Amino acid sequence: MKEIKGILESITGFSIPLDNGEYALYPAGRHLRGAIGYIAFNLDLPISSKFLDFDFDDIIFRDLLPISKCGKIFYPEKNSNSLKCPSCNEIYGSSVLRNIMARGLSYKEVIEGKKYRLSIIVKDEKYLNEMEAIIRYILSYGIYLGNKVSKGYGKFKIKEYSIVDILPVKDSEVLLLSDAIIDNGEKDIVFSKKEISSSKFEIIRKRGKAKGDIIRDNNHNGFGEIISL
């Protein structure tokens, strides 16, 4: 097991809508998965076939959680929309969003300059050979996460491709960094599969668990995530 670390920053702003006209503050790992699968199909890579597999259970993408001037990731504030890093507060929040009115199109973005965590957890080392190639393409051109990729919104640039290994969590009690798939969890989560080869945009809805919640689970390996805490 290993992971590729990164201080992924935004060249142009990203627009990710949620339900209830909510715009997400930071970019999520689902968006990274959806973009990297387009990369692997576009470069005729084999893992693209696994990219259209939503339960491959290797190459799991952790959320692009924002990084602070404290050098640490903003830990998500428990049961709250905004985030707060363990060192100081520096609290992210909505102020970073801007209401956009552009040619009829009224939407929102999140501004550029803030840095976000790259963390691609990979299990199979055979997949790491293609993983080095896809992080090496982004290294040259960039990745686009958001809406209006063809208009140019969402351009991301890595500044630190680091393939440093890691180990899973220890405590059973873990904090939910990202929203987790837990049935009858009363926190509705929506994403989609596009399947551009065969069309049929999906808009898959679910009722998983929300982020910022301490939960005890001995059967935990750590799209939810496990914070060691």
Partner 1 sequence: AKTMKKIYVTMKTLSPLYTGEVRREDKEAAQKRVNFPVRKTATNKVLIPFKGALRSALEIMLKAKGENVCDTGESRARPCGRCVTCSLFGSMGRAGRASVDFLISNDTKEQIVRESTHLRIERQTKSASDTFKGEEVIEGATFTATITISNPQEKDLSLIQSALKFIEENGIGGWLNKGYGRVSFEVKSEDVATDRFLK
8 A C-beta contact, residue 59 and residue 119 = no
Q: Name the one range near partner 1 by CB under 8 A: 141-149, 156-164, 184-192, 220-228.
A: 141-149
Q: How many CB atoms lie within 10 A of CB 185?
A: 16
Residue 178 contacts Zn ion per CB under 5 A: no
Residues 6+ positions from 15 with CB-CB distance below 8 Å: 23, 100, 107, 108, 109, 146, 147, 148, 153, 154
Residue 75 contacts partner 1 per CB under 8 A: no
Question: Can you read off the two tokens belonging to residue 228?
Answer: 């060691």
For residues 150 and 226, what is the distance between their CA atoms, to the nearest angstrom?
34
Looking at the Cβ atoms of 150 and 219, the one nearer to partner 1 is: 150
Residue 161 contacts partner 1 per CB under 8 A: no
**Residues between 22 and 61 that touch partner 1 (CB under 8 A):** 42-44
Binding test (CB under 8 A) with partner 1, winner from 62, 84, 155, 211: 155
Residue 68 contacts Zn ion per CB under 5 A: yes
CB of residue 97 vs partner 1: minimum separation in angstroms? 9
Size of site (CB under 8 A) for partner 1? 31
The entry of partner 1, Zn ion, none that residue 100 binds, CB within 5 to 8 Å by partner kind: partner 1
Binding test (CB under 8 A) with partner 1, winner from 69, 78, 126, 136: 136
Question: Can you read off the two tokens belonging to residue 7?
Answer: 């201080």
CA end-to-end span of the chain, whole Å?
A: 21
The entry of partner 1, Zn ion, none that residue 169 binds, CB within 5 to 8 Å by partner kind: none
Residue 77 contacts Zn ion per CB under 5 A: no
Residue 112's alpha-carbon distances to 90, 104, 153, 156, in angstroms, are: 17, 23, 10, 9
Binding test (CB under 8 A) with partner 1, winner from 134, 174, 177, 226: 134
| Nearest in space to 36 (alpha carbons), one of 20, 47, 23, 26 | 47
**Residues between 181 and 210 that touch partner 1 (CB under 8 A):** 196, 199
Looking at the Cβ atoms of 70 and 111, the one nearer to partner 1 is: 111
Residue 101 contacts partner 1 per CB under 8 A: yes
For residues 8 and 179, what is the distance between their CA atoms, to the nearest angstrom?
21
Q: Taking each helix axis from N to C terminus, what angle separates 125-140 and 29-42, rounded to the nearest 10 degrees?
A: 90
Task: Kindly list the residues in this chain that would bind partner 1 in the complex (CB under 8 A).
Answer: 11-13, 42-44, 98-103, 109, 111-113, 133-134, 136-137, 140-141, 144, 149-153, 155, 196, 199
